[model samples]
Target: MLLGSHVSMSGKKMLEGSAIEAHEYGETTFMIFTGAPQNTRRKSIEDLNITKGHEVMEKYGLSNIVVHAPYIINIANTTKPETFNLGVDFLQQEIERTQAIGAKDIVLHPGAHVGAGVDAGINKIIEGLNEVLTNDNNVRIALETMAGKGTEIGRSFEELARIIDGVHNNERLSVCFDTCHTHDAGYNVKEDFDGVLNEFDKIIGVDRIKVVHVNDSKNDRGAQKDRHENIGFGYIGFDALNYIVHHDSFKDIPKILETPYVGEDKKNKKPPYKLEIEMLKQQHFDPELKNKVMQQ
Candidate 1:
């Protein structure tokens, strides 16, 4: 199982610290934002300690680290030209930063249509993606499947396919299949995992999937809500999630956990990835996993 979770890349250590954190969590891969997801502020590439981070990654056998583009970049907002331009430009910078960090893939949430209509939104996305991919940077954008929350564009496989089909440099595009989002978007992942994959293969081609966000949904199927639950403790059961982690089709792709942390307060909250990974590896639901995570 190529399992990992989202880790912090803050402070002086940057990538080096993220690498060490993943190692401590017993992960073979992980995901991170170059900076705060809500803002555009960033440290220079030189100040990120990329070399030392690479060294740490090598030491821990960690590879295929994923970068998440900031949430503030929304290219689908056709109503505002300035917002669209900033999104496109910032995304290009993010791609360069991903390349600098020695990672090849950056997961992105396809912007919501926001009452602009689906076709218009997809066209805007294609326009922005074409502009962003014009550079020679080697990083690929893995457009994430959304939960249909609001008017999100990539709520279905065919929607993402349309955006990719429209892009001139389609080869640079890819998919990040998020379990929680897909479930909320009305895919029966818990019961018909293979069936869903079959439909996805027909619509978007499974080959385009570069990363899988392994999460259990807090909402019911088709709720279109995007709340994620800890492993085995939500609508999606441990059995189904375990099957996904060990799925044959996505065996080589990195499975990243974006599950909620345990604990009631910010200071006391802690990640549950260490135990979640252990549970997936063992194929058993640790009923006391949450308690143990809080205890730790």
Candidate 2:
């Protein structure tokens, strides 16, 4: 597995160079928000700090990178046409920007449908995605599995599978499994990691899974909340993570850590990312149980 984390790109002078810092710490894959994630204003892709990013990535021999879209982006909302159109344009530009910098995947939340029912939401998402795909063909979009919070859509594997099935251009669409979200949505990922994978394979097909957001949930199972915690310290313990990381099915995909940094509060505290990575490394693969069936 290519282990990495979502690093801060807020005030960094360069995107690629800032990401290289993770490489120095033994990261083989990395993820970062393309621009000021909260800011809605559009900026020229050329103005982005990619020149330094490219230089640093080449120097450090790092290539596996994924760009996370802004949190405020919601393609399924029919309330505001202007805002929706702006988001669509932003997504199209982001794909182009990532491609220009040589990144392969961009992870996105299949937008909330607001009052639009699941069927309507899926249609809106497909329409929005069609615009982006028609505009560009470079970077692939990885729709993230949501926690199904409130009116938010794309929580279930079936829902995501439906969205993928609706897309006219299937070449660039992929899925990103978020462990925390899955658990919060009542999938019991901690107790049934293999079961979760089996469900995913049945719904979306294993081959369509491209990236993973390996986060432990701070909330309880079936809470449908999106609180991320350090690995093993949360409701989902280290044992489940072991099954996830060592699984042969996910061996080739990029696993990015989105856990909270516990050390941010104190200088002496152990960084959460370090703890999580160490835990994943210590996972012992049991050959006898490799193909064991999971109880759903």
Candidate 3:
């Protein structure tokens, strides 16, 4: 599963170089937001140096690094052409930044449609993606599954499939499955974990999934919320996570923790990246599953 977590780059001055902190925590893969979510004031990709990131990855034998794009982007908003164009530009910038650091994928939300409807939103996302691809050709943009919160798109497997179909160039596009979002959107992955994957494969094709946001939901089923809880401590429980980590379908994809954490002061802190790594390592797979993964 290549277990890892979303590590903070708050104090680090560089993007690719900052992964050393996550590596020090025993992570094999990691996810990071390219810049501050509240604002877009960071140095441009070509301006930042990424030599350190390459050094860190080689030093720690890390194979997977993914970027989480900013939260303010709404590529699916068709009514706001300016906002949508900004999202496309931000995405291109993010791709350049990630590519500079040797990242494999950029996890992105499909975005909200406001009042434009789901089909319109999907088309808008495709349009934004087309623009990004036209500008850059090296990076893969992973459309993250959403929880259908508010007017947000991408709540169902069918909707994701539709979006994929809408894209003219699917080569640079892929999907990132977030467990918490899927469960909150009513997919019941806790009890029917394999079923969820099966449906995803049938609708979107398993080949399109390149990364995973391995989070447990703090909310109940069908709540359509986006809250995340730490592994084994959320509503999705440990069993479902066990299935996710040990599944053969996800063997090649980087599974990162977007889970919550508690600080030394007992306040809610970011989950130390190490804990999630250990959790995946200690996954008690049955002999049959173990054999299956070995074959892969």
The CA lDDT of each predicted structure is 0.92, 0.77, 0.78
Per model, how many backbone clashes are there? 0, 1, 2
- Cα displacement (angstroms), candidate 2, residue 270, comes to 8.0
What is the Å distance of residue 234 in model 3 from its true position? 1.5
Mark the regions of model 2 whose C-alpha exceeds 4 Å error after superposition: 263-271, 284-296
- Candidate 1 lDDT tens digits, 102-212: 777899988977889999999999989988886678899999999998888899999999998999575798999999999999999999999999999999889889999
Kindly indicate the candidate among 1 and 3 with the higher lDDT.
1
- TM per prediction: 0.98, 0.88, 0.89
> In model 1, which regions exceed 4 Å deviation?
none
How close to the true structure is residue 99 of candidate 1, measured as C-alpha lDDT?
Answer: 90
Error of 2 at 26 (Å): 2.4
Clashing pairs in 1: none
Candidate 3 lDDT over residue span 1-296, tens digit each: 48788776554556554577677768887878766766656676654546766677788878778888888899898887889988988887778778876777888888988998888888888888878886455678888889989998888989888877887677788899999999999998899888887888889888888998888788988999999976776799777887887788888788888775555445433344465566568774232322232232
Per-residue error at 177 for model 1, in Å? 0.3
Those runs of model 3 whose alpha carbons end farther than 4 Å from true positions after fitting are: 263-270, 284-296
RMSD of every candidate to native, in Å, equals 0.9, 6.5, 6.0
